[PDB]
Design a protein around this ligand. Structure first.
Ligand SMILES: Nc1ncnc2c1ncn2[C@@H]1O[C@H](COP(=O)(O)OP(=O)(O)O)[C@@H](O)[C@H]1O
Ligand SMILES: Nc1ncnc2c1ncn2[C@@H]1O[C@H](COP(=O)(O)OP(=O)(O)O)[C@@H](O)[C@H]1O
Ligand SMILES: Nc1ncnc2c1ncn2[C@@H]1O[C@H](COP(=O)(O)OP(=O)(O)O)[C@@H](O)[C@H]1O
Ligand SMILES: Nc1ncnc2c1ncn2[C@@H]1O[C@H](COP(=O)(O)OP(=O)(O)O)[C@@H](O)[C@H]1O
Ligand SMILES: [Mg+2]
Ligand SMILES: [Mg+2]
Ligand SMILES: [Mg+2]
Ligand SMILES: [Mg+2]
Lengths: 49, 447, 97, 442, 443, 430
């Protein structure tokens, strides 16, 4: 508990930026990753803005 | 550019300076001089690009700082991407986890690559409406779902087993999914853009992608490049892919390797997979155990042996593991099957070009009189030495704030940092102060 | 949310899941054989040797410390493990035989 | 088409019950050596003797290994042959003795052949046959179950005992789906739906296989071969997905464990039981250890007791060295590196160096497999160079001469090309002579 | 109060802006040459352009090598990573020495990561599920959305959540009146504890109590935390994720070092090479320091040649004392400093001079001022002569015990009689050898 | 407590000293060794001061003269609540752990940290506890009566409190202590004890934890098991680098304090040269214990090298260490020491036997006679007389040989004993 003192203040999740990526082969495929990355919805939020 | 931008020992060397006639240029492609050695390396370059020959070794010989390491490194750059290359050291194959024999077998396995191609038939489209009747009649009432794409929209009938399969990974429609044609596998890509405004805080699974364009079902082929080593590690374990990253192989039995060889043979017979001959380079092989030498002698004759090149600067010396002194530091059996390429020490004219071409890499402007003193000190010292002084003199000149490095700053940089030959003298005169092999040292100055 | 979606989506498999099952599944058929009688895996030998185990197992660990089993795996009333995780593990151990 | 220092060797190149030919299978000269090995091929094909070892000795580049590859070709692909090096005996996982005993049992293979009658095809219909029960009762009683089978070019109707309804219920087959039925063993197997049913649904997750070709009733035989070691590994290793011991298989790492003698004898018992009934066939193989000079005296000692084993196969050894000190003992001196007690248990096959005229034929025969063709003038230089520098040097210079010929666009090697290739690549003697004249530490 | 072990009186190199070294600065006396020599090293470390460059400073014992190697680390600052290492530490039973050397090589360099997170936190007022009457055919029973109100000191706000993040709340067993922590990025919910005002409700309570969080509701913050690449590699090797019963025993097992493949390192260099292109991350080099390099085997010396030629190779500084000696792992090879000549060719040589007696007298003075004790000048001269007759580090050791004898004599200042008494109770090496030579059993 | 039968050092307790640090002739089981006791006392007060850390001191002397007893008296005089670590030189060599990490682990073990925590506890006899099943009105309703001598009040439980009382079976009439902040119950006995006073009291709880103990917990899921099981297995240095900074912040905040314990190493002459090379770097750091090393041998060969360094230690390590020399005992001190052992072992020795035991102690060794003093009591026990006699000392002298006598016997009997070359004659004749 003394080492559980506030962390996420200065802590980075490090799992949100995909530096843990070695866990991505279990449930995820190749072509689904390529098409999933190609189909992104970006530029729609810019229009709605 | 994709690699990290921090400068290395040799960052200037890119490719080899040989033309289509293989005649080397005096200064080209980042290198300088070494004409005959560069041509002898280019013969190996076309020897690899041909790919019709296997199981041969070649040696690069020379004294220290003669360009032997910048030679094999230039071969890997001209060889290009997608051609697998393995550069290790002879001291690295000594491991407590793996035996030297198997650790060397993996060193031979990683070099040769395999390209596998596979075709897929998938149905991907955004869903409009999904109807499934339950209590109206019963028993898989044949519901129908409507899949939408930008340029096409159709309605598909759903079978009983597909009714059972759609329940898992539940779909509310309003969604983009992809169904495998062969296995009927359901995959959920993610929600559309109209669903983004529903919640202020949403889970980590959610996401938004554009509707797929074109035909509903497509035929696409995918290409993969996987080395034989990765195949063997994957087949050796229930989960071997984690064993790749964790680095624990487990000393794969040689029994599985033959099965993998038969698999690759069948894949080549079917034409689905083609192999790319790779290159293996071992640096500083003057220190190696004799068991590794014999295992190299035998393992070089197999059907898949990557081309092996090595560099050793030791003269006639005792081999590690035996009392006798064999020439070159290697047994005569390894020298019997091999080809030796010798490198010669650079002259004064070439050293100044090796210097300026280095200042262009460090982006350090030099005066016309700085290369004179740095070259003069470069002749007595080793070429690998003054290259550090070209780096320090830039900072010493930076303290003086003015532009190019002046000669006086080079003299101060040489004064602050001793040469390897001077330290021997300063040690020999001060010997009583430094510790001795016998352990005797005089700490007190007072006598 | 735009940056959230721009981050989350580009997750690339370093190789593939399809490369794992592509280099694994064997082209050869099942070929049902008597080799099933030539294997006799280690798990079945524990069942077939029941008599020898019954007769020749005698000695007992005279000195034990109770509640050292719960504390070894880290699952107990108070620990650093999650509250529901220790329960799910307890049920999984209660099921698997 | 990849060629590494080999592939011009096809078999031993002998003839029928006679002295070996002059040139056959890419072999030139050394008729006595490949003849004596030719007798060893017959000894191995006899499948009688056990633990009989032989050793071929001779200088380097005398063709020691090509003879072992040749007898490996002569035995055939079905006979197991294990290439092995003396340096491979040292392993951090297990002791050297266990690795040597394992490689000793990797040599002998075992073949299994099985003939099974099958019934395959579509399902025309399924109907029960009602008959009176032996003891009177109100309920239904079925005497037999009728199953129709449709295949390409034929059709058939079958009658089975009523106990088949449990297996059919297990396989869940009803109508219009191709099944798999074994005659005597029985039950069923469902391979997949018939192909004509793919059109009725636009989207379905079940694949449709075509009807079986040929008759609905077939009899086929399948032969499967497995080595005794690969058999033992399956016995020692636990197999399960969800089992607790198998659960400890995951998250931990498997490592080679020393196999007990009791388990090996137990496998020998069942292998003998199946070989007595005629279903199993035991074919001894050949073990090959290159560079036996690299073996420690502890392994040489275990070979003495190991070669006297009953199931021990034939092992061929190669040692190029002369009188040497055996590894592990500084004072002891024995020929070839093999202790005299171990030399006493084997037969020595001498090898002789190749003549000049034999060397030129070696290079000219290597040119065909290399696919490169050379003139007569440039070949005479490759002969003299091969005799002076070394044999493997002239064979190594073949590819650089061809690449230089491609740079000069010529399709055949020339004297200028072999000289230019001589200047670029140096042999051992020239390099060792250069090391003496340089004080640079080169 | 404060602890001082043979150090902490050195606050840096103490160099002027022109690069000239003062006579005495920062607890350092003399050695202007070696100080000016290391300042340019600090400048090269700040330049970030050079990688793999190495500089060796070699001198006699107690010449100030190591003390200077701490001074450069003080000059770099806390932001620049500095990893101390000794040659004897590279040998490990778990993994080969090579993987430990390359491992520390990556432990030297470091990288900064910045990312923005938005969090809703506060006390739960009223949370209600919202169920849809439409069956939709996909599910038998579910919820369309879950509305959870949040109360904070500055203001209150109601939120609309998806059924999954509400299921997490149901896993946390949150009830009305308990403070929760909900992050938007990962979507994780954490219960801090029950609100402080509700504590008086019960006489005895198991749950802890915390005050209501400050802030309106929503908060925007970024985290600039910097992390070394090797820590990304270790975090990459051992996953912390998953609820599987296998993963639990994987956390229970002790961490065991393993040899990391070059492929994984290459992938980490790829993703970092992308993040430095987006500008979200900034890579900074760092300095590796090895003491007693002469204890290294020729194998590690050979691997250092290939390691220094890498692009990610950090700047490493070496320090050795002994003169020309046989290199460890070599039979007949004799090389200066105990380093092979091929490696000496790569490094840069800096030499360290001994100290004059008048400088030693000042060293004892400064060590006494940092020691806070009181020394008479007449005894200071004798301590100087004593330090010059035996060793420099022996007088700095003599300053410690005299303070205790002065307290027993109640004198505030050290007297010549005190140190003369301290010399009889404590002997140096030279006297110990002399008495060791003549005695019955090993003195 | 702490059952112990007899130890070599069992008599000497806490060395001996005066406020002037001048040693008494006989003080607390310590005779002889004047200067050595004064220097060791200076080191002791240096440890108690704690202003200086990471200093090495050497204790040199002949075998069986004033060496280990010194460090024993320093450890006993240092007393409880301060760390003291004593490890043999052969103990740091390990197959599972590296020599460097096993050497650092002691440096981490020798420095402790005190952490204080304040809690509010309610303890007292429970006369009546009522617990009710869930009803629509409230989740659970219960009332427990905690009776103490000064005050008796009733508390209404907090739900999960009721789960703690129903979790472990509690019988009315036993004295328990309930922890409000911790949420657990502690039973101190039955009503064995008596209620002291008011139910709720604010107390502070001090916990003494070494740097090693803090280091192991963070590197593992459960590290406290790795403390006892010794499976620790080379904790990362990064974790320790975090522990040091966190401890620094704890010190600046005042929530913790550090105690500069002592590290004593027996048999340092057998330590490997690599460990000697690591100690030099380990001493110069911020957190290090005061190190004391003792070697019997001198002018010998250092393990790991061919050359012979003086005293058996490298000079680089000798620079960092201060040397203390011990002297052989005189005849008048040996009799007093043997008398102290006589008073320790409950052995009655006559003056006539004390004279012979002293003469044999001077002629051979002290360790020998101090072994004989124990053996003679049984020979005297067979004679049923309570006090030992000269004849029993002579009988114990002839029965059990000395070393010097055994060597002189072996030299004559060498033909019977096995030889370095392996030659032995087991046949009597020819
Ligand atoms: N062709 C070349 N042109 C310019 N510089 C070269 C060339 N070859 C080598 N060098 C120089 O040599 C140095 C490396 O020498 P290296 O090959 O490592 O010698 P060795 O392998 O004998 O240790 C580099 O600093 C590089 O500047
Ligand atoms: N009869 C032959 N005809 C042609 N080439 C041969 C013959 N015998 C050996 N060789 C050549 O010798 C090489 C193999 O030599 P090897 O036996 O490995 O030498 P060592 O005796 O040192 O093991 C092969 O590349 C092959 O080309
Ligand atoms: N120039 C100097 N000024 C002040 N103190 C010094 C100086 N040089 C050395 N010292 C002191 O000497 C002590 C030991 O020197 P150190 O650098 O450890 O020697 P080495 O480099 O041989 O290990 C250090 O505690 C340091 O405070
Ligand atoms: N000053 C002393 N007072 C009392 N007993 C002593 C003293 N010095 C040594 N001894 C005795 O010596 C024995 C152990 O000797 P020790 O100090 O261990 O020698 P060393 O440390 O050289 O091995 C103990 O049983 C103790 O009784
Ligand atoms: Mg190199
Ligand atoms: Mg061979
Ligand atoms: Mg030092
Ligand atoms: Mg002792």
């Amino acid at each position: 508990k003394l080492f559980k003192k506030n962390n996420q203040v200065n802590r980075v999740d490090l799992d949100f930026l995909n530096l843990v990526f070695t866990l991505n082969d279990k449930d995820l495929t190749s072509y689904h990753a390529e098409e999933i990355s190609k189909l992104t919805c970006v530029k729609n939020f810019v229009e709605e803005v | 550019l994709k690699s990290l931008s921090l400068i290395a020992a040799h960052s200037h060397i890119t490719g080899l300076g040989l033309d289509e006639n293989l005649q080397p240029r005096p200064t080209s492609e980042g290198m300088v001089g070494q004409l005959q050695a560069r041509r002898a390396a280019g013969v190996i370059l076309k020897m690899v690009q041909n790919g019709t020959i296997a199981g041969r070794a070649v040696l690069v010989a020379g004294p220290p700082s003669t360009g032997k390491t910048a030679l094999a490194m230039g071969v890997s750059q001209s060889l290009g991407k997608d051609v697998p290359f393995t550069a290790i050291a002879g001291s690295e194959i000594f491991s407590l986890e793996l035996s030297k024999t198997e650790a060397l077998t993996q060193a031979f396995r990683k070099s040769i690559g395999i390209k596998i191609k596979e075709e897929t038939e998938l149905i991907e489209g955004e869903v409009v409406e999904i109807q499934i009747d339950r209590s109206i009649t019963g028993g898989h009432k044949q519901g129908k779902l409507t899949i939408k794409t930008t340029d096409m929209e159709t309605i598909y009938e759903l079978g009983n087993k597909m009714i059972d399969g759609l329940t898992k990974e539940k779909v509310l429609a309003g969604d983009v999914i992809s169904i495998d044609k062969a296995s009927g596998k359901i995959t959920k890509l993610g929600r559309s853009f109209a669903r983004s405004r529903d919640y202020d805080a949403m889970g980590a699974d959610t996401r938004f992608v554009q509707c797929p364009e074109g035909e509903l079902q497509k035929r696409k082929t995918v290409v993969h490049t996987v080395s034989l080593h990765e195949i063997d590690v994957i087949n050796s374990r229930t989960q071997g892919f984690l064993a790749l990253f964790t680095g624990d192989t487990g000393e794969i039995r040689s029994e599985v390797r033959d099965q993998i060889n038969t698999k690759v043979a069948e894949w080549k017979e079917e034409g689905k997979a083609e192999i790319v001959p790779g290159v293996l380079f071992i640096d500083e092989v003057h220190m190696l155990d004799i068991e590794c030498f014999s295992f190299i002698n035998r393992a070089l004759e197999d059907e898949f042996a990557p081309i092996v090149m090595m560099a050793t600067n030791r003269g006639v010396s005792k081999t590690r593991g035996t009392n006798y002194k064999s020439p070159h530091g290697l047994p005569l059996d390894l020298l019997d099957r091999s080809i030796i390429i010798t490198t010669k020490s650079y002259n004064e004219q070439e050293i100044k070009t090796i210097l300026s071409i280095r200042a262009q890499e460090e982006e350090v402007e030099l005066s016309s009189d700085a290369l004179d003193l740095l070259t003069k000190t470069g002749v007595e010292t080793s070429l690998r030495y003054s290259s550090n002084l070209i780096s320090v003199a830039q900072q010493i000149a930076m303290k003086r704030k003015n532009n190019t490095v002046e000669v006086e700053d080079v003299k101060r940089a040489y004064l602050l940092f001793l040469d390897s030959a001077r330290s021997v003298k300063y040690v020999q005169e001060n010997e009583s102060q430094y510790i001795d092999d016998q352990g005797n040292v005089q700490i007190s100055i007072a006598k | 949310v735009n940056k959230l979606r721009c981050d989350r989506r580009p997750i690339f498999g370093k190789n593939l899941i399809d490369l794992l099952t592509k280099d694994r599944r064997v082209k050869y058929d099942k070929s049902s054989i008597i080799d099933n009688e030539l294997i006799k895996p280690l798990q079945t030998r524990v069942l077939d040797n029941r008599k020898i185990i019954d007769t020749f197992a005698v000695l007992t660990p005279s000195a034990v410390s109770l509640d050292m089993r719960k504390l070894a795996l880290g699952l107990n009333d108070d620990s650093s493990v999650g509250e529901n995780t220790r329960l799910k593990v307890m049920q999984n151990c209660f099921e698997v035989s | 088409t990849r060629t590494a220092a080999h592939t011009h060797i096809k078999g031993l190149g002998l003839d029928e019950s006679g002295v070996a030919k002059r040139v056959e299978g890419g072999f030139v000269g050394q008729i006595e050596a490949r003849e004596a090995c030719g007798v060893i091929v017959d000894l191995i094909k006899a499948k009688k003797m056990s633990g009989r070892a032989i050793l071929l000795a001779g200088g380097p580049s005398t063709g020691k290994t090509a003879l072992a590859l040749a007898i490996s070709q002569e035995l055939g692909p079905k006979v197991p042959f294990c290439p092995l090096v003396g340096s491979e005996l040292y392993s951090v996982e297990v002791k050297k003795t266990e690795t040597l005993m394992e490689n000793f049992r990797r040599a002998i293979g075992l073949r299994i052949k099985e003939t099974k009658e099958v019934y395959e095809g579509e399902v025309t219909e399924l109907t029960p046959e009602d008959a009176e029960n032996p003891l009177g009762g109100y309920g239904k009683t079925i005497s037999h179950v009728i199953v129709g089978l449709k295949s390409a070019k034929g059709t058939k109707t079958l009658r089975l005992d009523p106990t088949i309804y449990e297996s059919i219920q297990r396989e869940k087959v009803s109508i219009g789906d191709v099944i798999y039925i074994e005659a005597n063993t029985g039950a069923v197997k469902r391979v997949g739906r018939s192909d004509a049913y793919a059109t009725e649904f636009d989207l379905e997750t079940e694949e449709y296989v075509p009807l079986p070709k040929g008759e609905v009733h077939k009899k086929k035989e399948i032969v499967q071969d497995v080595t005794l070691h690969d058999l033992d590994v399956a016995n020692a290793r636990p197999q399960g997905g969800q089992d607790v011991i198998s659960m400890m298989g995951q998250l931990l790492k498997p490592k080679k464990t020393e196999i007990t003698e009791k388990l090996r004898q137990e496998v020998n018992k069942v292998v003998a039981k199946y070989i007595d009934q005629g279903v199993a066939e035991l074919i001894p193989g050949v073990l090959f250890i290159d560079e036996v000079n690299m073996l420690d005296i502890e392994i040489f000692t275990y070979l003495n007791k190991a070669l006297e084993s009953n199931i021990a196969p034939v092992v061929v050894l190669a040692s190029n060295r002369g009188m040497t000190t055996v590894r592990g003992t500084e004072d002891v001196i024995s020929p070839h590196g093999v202790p005299p007690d171990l030399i006493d248990r084997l037969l020595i096959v001498r090898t002789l160096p190749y003549d000049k005229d034999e060397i030129r034929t070696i290079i000219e025969r290597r040119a065909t497999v290399e696919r490169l063709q050379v003139e007569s003038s440039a070949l005479d230089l490759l002969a003299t160079m091969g005799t002076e520098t070394s044999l493997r040097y002239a064979l190594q210079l073949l590819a650089p001469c061809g690449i230089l010929a491609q740079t000069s666009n010529r399709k055949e090697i020339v004297v200028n090309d072999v000289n230019e290739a001589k200047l670029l690549f140096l042999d051992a003697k020239r390099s060792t002579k250069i090391l003496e004249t340089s004080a640079n530490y080169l």
